[PDB]
Amino acid sequence: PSRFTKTRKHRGHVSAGKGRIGKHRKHPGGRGMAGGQHHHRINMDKYHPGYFGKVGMRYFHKQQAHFWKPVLNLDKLWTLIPEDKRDQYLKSASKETAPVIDTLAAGYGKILGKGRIPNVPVIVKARFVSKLAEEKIRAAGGVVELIA
Amino acid sequence: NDVDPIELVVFLPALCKKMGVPYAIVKGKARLGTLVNQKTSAVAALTEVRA
């Protein structure tokens, strides 16, 4: 709030913390990102490299739905099952009742493989999977099949 | 014959010819109107006649 701002400590000091020689002016360097190629080149080319240019292709009418693909790692995979029944599922690890996890209904598009899923069989439902994720799922004894 | 604008009946002779109904371009829409108890008629037809 105002009573703590240092302008209150600046009452009585003539230049108000802006220098006598500099004489704080209204717009000394231009306005906005002005002069990014002429006199602010060093600042732009030292702290924001790659600012100027046309890299890549122009995507017309980009809908973020097409690229909607939230990531899910195998370690985070077990968090989808509710807590009350997670404990009974890690124990009694059995092929004939393997928990099925609707990662898509949970809001995850792809299954990634950060790793170390325990040796229990889990049926994984997802839009996409990766080489290592499916290998580890098989290594745990479970299976992954795709949905849409 | 004096239908204004003329395109209202411009196709009637063609339409009559294709269907084969006899047609007569009579002089005066007022005559047609006065045989139908109106101001003008611009067209008149008989579909049935006493014996």
Binding site: - | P5, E7, L8, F11
Partner: protein, 203 residues
């Protein structure tokens, strides 16, 4: 129905018969006034589909509007400003000649609402429109509530506001991604997307 034949036959605007009719009609439209009442529509089929019913209360004016662009009214053709606006010739009016015709007819007969208007003919330096007018203060049209919506005070001078078929076209009020800027009024959308919507609890 004759109007089905009339509509298709009036579509052939370059046939010999249609050319002869428009040759004769453009002349006697020209020797009459710029704005003059037509005693009956010269395109009854077009008037019928645009809502003209041959009952007393409906009015048909014929209006003659100058062709060509709009020359910007600056003296000596000198527009003082940046060169991107120095252009005084070649500037195109944003309202169709149909819309200009409806406006001049409406301001001539201010006691009528402009139902619609339609191209009737055209020559080198004029365009010709028959403007469908409906009298809101005639008891015939006040009754028959199929048409009593136009005597509602919100519909007076709908051509000046741009509410007829041409007005909708000029403003680009159409459904589609082609009209994302102009869907409910480009000034409303512009104001909609330039407002700073601040809340009680800032977001």
């Amino acid at each position: 129905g004759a109007y089905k034949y009339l509509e298709e036959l009036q579509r052939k605007k370059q046939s010999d018969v249609l050319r002869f009719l428009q040759r004769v009609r453009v002349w006697e439209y020209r020797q009459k006034n710029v704005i003059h009442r037509a005693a009956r529509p010269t395109r009854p089929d077009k008037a019928r589909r645009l809502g003209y019913k041959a009952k007393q209360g409906f009015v048909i004016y014929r209006v003659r509007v100058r062709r060509g662009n709009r020359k910007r009214p600056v003296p000596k053709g000198a527009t003082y400003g940046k060169p991107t606006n120095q252009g005084v010739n070649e500037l195109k009016y944003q309202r169709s000649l149909r819309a200009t015709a409806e406006e001049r007819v409406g301001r001539r007969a201010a006691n009528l609402r402009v139902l619609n208007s339609y191209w009737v003919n055209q020559d080198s330096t004029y365009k010709y429109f028959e403007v469908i007018l409906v009298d809101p203060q005639h008891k015939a049209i006040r009754r028959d509530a199929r048409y009593n919506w136009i005597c509602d005070p919100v519909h007076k001078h709908r051509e000046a506001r741009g509410l007829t078929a041409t007005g909708k076209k000029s403003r680009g009020i159409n459904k589609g991604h082609k009209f994302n800027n102009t869907k409910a009024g480009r000034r409303k959308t512009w104001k909609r997307q330039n407002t700073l919507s601040l809340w009680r609890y800032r977001k």
